[PDB]
């Protein structure tokens, strides 16, 4: 029925988005940036470059100051669009050298007003960036192996990796090689530069990469016959319409991973919907077809061969965030630290680089939970590193609250937010820490809290014990305020399922601490012994959850 699908011959633009991509490879702008725009400034920029083609280089326009949730909407673009950019650095597998981390630090301090926030896909993002500076940055970034290619846009985003790839005592294998090949073969090249939408990938020999909600995932497992390799998952995403990615039923040896990845991405390009902008993502195609039909098309049209059947690995009970100290195959140590919802700074990143040098380490990783871990810390030097990290506010022994909270960017910089999230979190974690110290003794089990500024679910609303979806609400009728809809009891891993939404429920941004306190105290009262939060949410009365 013409859903825009390329492989049915229905190859015509059905959107303004699908139409600007018809004007040649979007990645071409790079020349127009270095030739034209970086000299004339923001006003020279074509609106189709500005609001579309820029993304293929991780340049997203940032939110003008002073506008609250009232103004958020597709109709107000010109007002909400400031003369500054968010810039997103692509860090496949989170993996950086000390030198690269220092460069990141200096870029931020000098060009981004010292803004630097670790995203929950292992990237850093800068803000307050002016086009004038973008070539200069690209040049320093490239001088340490980093790029912004396809960091935003209708194309493959960062490939996620285990923050302990190659050093974990519990990894089935180290598939870093696959991630590295995928970047080298496919990233930056025409074949996958124009997809139905954004495309998210996760590859790891641990389940530490939130795979269940990626478009495609290769997660380690021991085939009883064939040994260590990767189980293939497909069809994931959480926005307004959440859906768990599902097992293809396949085992893939490490050597064939880049190949198979290409084939899945190729099906997306050729058979993904390109009609409705909010019905374009792979999860939908997978909902319609079913896995059997998809596996068939992958094997017969693209691979020209069967995939080997394989098992699923035992879903983990608790998630793996790698926070704290752990022993490595090196014999050395890894140390994970927890900022508050990814918020650091140029000064801090540079500070960490010097601590790394003092400790003799040249490897650090960003985390899919907005955290960072440093590898190759010998025992002698461990204590000194930990203390230095604390003095910068990066705790290897954080409280539950600081450890387990995530938030998106929110109204501080984002054009689609109704509420403030990243700054709120900076005050909220401490509040919770002291306000519930009272009860901390009892909390043998962690309560994950995710604060999102709108329904897009960037900080993963539906998979938190306490998820918050920012929206506009009303009180006294002479005031519509910023507040949150509440999702309770979401989780991945064993029996992954989304959180339940509450009936007539709005929590104002001032009440977040009150509400969390209330509910968590109710949790420790009406509680079973050894019971997780997501389980107690099945049964307690609806009054106990408000
Ligand atoms: C930074 C980050 C949040 C964070 O603090 O971690 C983030 C923030 C933004 N996301 Fe994202 N998303 C981020 C992870 C995600 C995730 C989570 C994930 O991948 O695990 C999701 C949910 C999972 C998913 O994609 O299904 C997510 C779903 C969105 C949405 C919803 C899209 C959709 O499929 O309908 C938008 C909007 C869109 O694409 O149209 C989007 C849009 C955005 C934009 C670019 C807003 C915009 O379009 O103007 C945000 C950046 C604005 C700014 O100035 O900061 N981003 N966003 C994460 C970036 C990681 C990265 O390096 O790529
Ligand atoms: S969830 Fe919405 S408000 Fe938060 S960063 Fe993502 S797009 Fe912006
Ligand atoms: Cl995103």
Domain identity same for 310 and 414: no
Q: Please give the Cα distance from 291 to 193 (Å, whole number).
A: 25
CB 159 within 8 A of CB 177: no
CB 164 within 8 A of CB 334: yes
Q: What is the largest CA-CA distance in the chain?
A: 68
Which residue range forms the structural domain that includes residue 405?
399-546
Residues contacting 193, CB < 8 A, separation 6+: 25, 26, 27, 56, 150, 155
Going by CA atoms, what residue is nearest to atom 31 of ligand 1?
456
Domain identity same for 299 and 195: yes
CA dihedral 449, 155, 281, 258 (to 10 degrees): -90
Q: Which domain-ending residue is among 81, 98, 131? A: 81
Domain identity same for 472 and 429: yes
Q: Compute the distance from residue 517 Cα to the ligand 1 centre, in Å.
A: 29
DSSP per residue, 121-139: TS-EEEEEE-GGGHHHHHH
Distances (CA, A) of 311 to 15, 222, 225, 335: 41, 8, 11, 32
Pocket probe mutation, ligand 2, options 120, 343, 406, 454, max atoms within 8 Å of Cβ: 454
Query: 357: helix, coil or strand?
Result: helix
Domain identity same for 387 and 442: no
Tell the burial category of 529 from Cβ atoms under 10 Å away from its Cβ (0-12, 13-18, 19+): exposed
Residue whose token pair is 């420790």:
524
Q: Compute the distance from residue 111 Cα to the ligand 2 centre, in Å.
A: 23
CA dihedral (293, 296, 302, 308) positive or negative = positive
Q: For the chain, what is the radius of gyration of the CA atoms?
A: 23
Domain identity same for 311 and 358: no
Query: What technique determined this structure?
Result: X-ray
Q: Please give the Cα distance from 513 to 476 (Å, whole number).
A: 22
CB 483 within 8 A of CB 473: yes
Pocket probe mutation, ligand 2, options 239, 410, 464, max atoms within 8 Å of Cβ: 410
Here the tokens at position 324 are 């704290």
SS (H, E, C) 439-496: HHCCCCCCCCEEEECCCCCCCCHHHCCEEEEEEEEECCCCCEEEEEEEEECCECCCCC
CB 187 within 8 A of CB 261: no
| DSSP H/E element including 199 | strand 199-204
Looking at residue 444, which CATH number applies to its domain? 3.30.413.10
β-pairing, 324-327 with 124-129?
unpaired
CB 128 within 8 A of CB 120: no
Q: Please give the Cα distance from 21 to 27 (Å, whole number).
A: 10
Q: Compute the distance from residue 444 Cα to the ligand 3 centre, in Å.
A: 33
Instruction: Compute CA 18 distance to the chain's CA centroid, rounded to the nearest angstrom.
Output: 25
Give the closest residue to 373 by CA, choosing from 125, 141, 127, 118.
Answer: 118
CA terminus-to-terminus distance, the chain: 45
Give the closest residue to 56 by CA, choosing from 10, 23, 80.
Answer: 23
Domain identity same for 69 and 169: no
Domain identity same for 326 and 472: no
Q: Compute the distance from residue 437 Cα to the ligand 1 centre, in Å.
A: 33
Q: Please give the Cα distance from 402 to 9 (Å, whole number).
A: 51
CA dihedral 175, 181, 182, 183 (to 10 degrees): 110
Domain identity same for 232 and 371: no
Domain identity same for 46 and 66: yes
Domain identity same for 373 and 473: no
CB 284 within 8 A of CB 273: yes
**Annotated binding-site residue numbers:** 408, 414, 454, 458
Sheet containing strand 372-377, edge to edge, reads 95-96, 364-366, 372-377, 333-337, 324-327
Domain identity same for 404 and 474: yes
Q: Please give the Cα distance from 396 to 208 (Å, whole number).
A: 18
Count of domains forming the chain? 4
Give the number of residues written for the chain. 546
Resolution value (Å, 1 decimal): 2.8
Q: Please give the Cα distance from 260 to 218 (Å, whole number).
A: 10
CB of 416 closer than 6 angstroms to any ligand 1 atom: yes
| DSSP H/E element including 267 | helix 257-271
Query: 425: helix, coil or strand?
Result: helix
Domain identity same for 302 and 168: yes
Q: Which domain-ending residue is among 376, 398, 420? A: 398
Q: Where are the beta strands (DSSP E) in 310-462?
A: 324-327, 333-337, 343-345, 364-366, 372-377, 405-407, 449-452
CB of 237 closer than 6 angstroms to any ligand 1 atom: yes
CB of 408 closer than 6 angstroms to any ligand 2 atom: yes
Q: Which domain-ending residue is among 81, 115, 130? A: 81
Q: Compute the distance from residue 301 Cα to the ligand 2 centre, in Å.
A: 37
Looking at residue 371, which CATH number applies to its domain? 3.90.480.10
For residue 324, the cross-strand partners are 336
């Amino acid at each position: 029925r013409n859903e825009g699908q390329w492989a049915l011959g229905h190859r015509e633009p059905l959107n303004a988005n699908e139409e600007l991509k018809k004007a040649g490879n979007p990645l071409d702008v790079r020349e127009r940036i270095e030739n034209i725009y970086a000299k004339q400034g923001f006003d020279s920029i074509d609106k189709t470059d500005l609001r579309g083609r820029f993304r293929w280089w991780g340049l997203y326009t940032q939110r003008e100051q002073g506008y609250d949730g009232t103004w958020t909407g597709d109709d107000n673009i010109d007002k909400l669009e400031a003369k500054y950019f968010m810039m997103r650095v692509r860090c496949d597998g989170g993996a950086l050298s000390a030198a690269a981390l220092r460069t990141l630090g200096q870029i931020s301090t000098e060009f981004a007003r010292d803004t630097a926030d670790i995203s929950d896909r292992q990237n850093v993002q800068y803000h307050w960036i002016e086009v004038e500076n973008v070539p200069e940055i690209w040049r320093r970034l490239d001088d340490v192996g980093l790029q912004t290619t396809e960091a935003c846009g209708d194309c493959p985003r960062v490939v996620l990796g285990s923050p302990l790839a190659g050093e974990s005592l519990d990894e089935v294998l180290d598939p870093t090689w696959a991630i590295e090949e995928i970047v080298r073969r496919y990233i930056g090249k025409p074949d996958f530069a124009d997809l139905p939408r954004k495309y998210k990938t996760a590859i790891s020999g641990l389940q530490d990469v939130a795979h269940e909600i990626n478009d495609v995932a290769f997660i380690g497992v021991n085939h009883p016959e064939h040994g260590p390799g990767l189980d293939l998952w497909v069809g994931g995403g959480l926005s307004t319409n959440p859906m768990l990615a599902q097992r293809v039923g396949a085992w893939v040896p490490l050597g064939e991973v880049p190949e198979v990845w290409a084939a899945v991405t190729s099906v997306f390009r050729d058979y993904g919907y390109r009609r409705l902008r909010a019905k374009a993502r792979l999860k939908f195609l997978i909902k319609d077809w079913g896995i059997a039909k998809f596996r068939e098309v992958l094997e017969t049209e693209y691979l020209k061969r069967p995939l080997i059947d394989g098992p699923a690995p035992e879903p983990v009970k608790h998630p793996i965030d790698h926070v704290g100290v752990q022993r490595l195959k090196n014999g050395l140590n890894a140390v994970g630290v927890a900022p508050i919802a990814g918020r650091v700074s140029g000064t801090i990143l540079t500070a960490v680089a010097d601590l790394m040098a003092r400790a003799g380490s040249d490897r650090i990783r960003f985390t899919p939970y907005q955290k960072l871990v440093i590898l190759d810390i010998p025992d002698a030097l461990l204590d000194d590193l930990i203390a230095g990290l604390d003095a910068l506010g990066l705790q290897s022994r954080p409280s539950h609250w600081r450890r387990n909270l995530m938030a998106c960017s929110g109204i501080e910089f984002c054009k689609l937010s109704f509420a403030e999230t990243r700054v709120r979190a900076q005050h909220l974690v401490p509040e919770l820490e002291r306000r519930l110290e009272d009860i901390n003794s009892q909390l043998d089990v962690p309560i994950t809290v995710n604060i999102n500024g709108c329904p897009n679910s960037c900080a993963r609303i539906q998979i938190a014990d306490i998820g918050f979806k920012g929206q506009m609400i009303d009180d006294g009728h002479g005031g519509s305020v910023e507040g949150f809809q509440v999702h309770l009891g979401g989780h991945l891993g064993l029996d992954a399922g989304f959180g339940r939404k509450l009936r007539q429920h709005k929590v104002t941004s001032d009440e977040l601490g009150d509400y969390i306190d209330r509910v968590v105290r109710n949790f420790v009262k009406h509680r079973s012994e050894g019971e997780r939060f997501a389980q107690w949410v099945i049964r307690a009365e609806e009054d106990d959850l408000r």
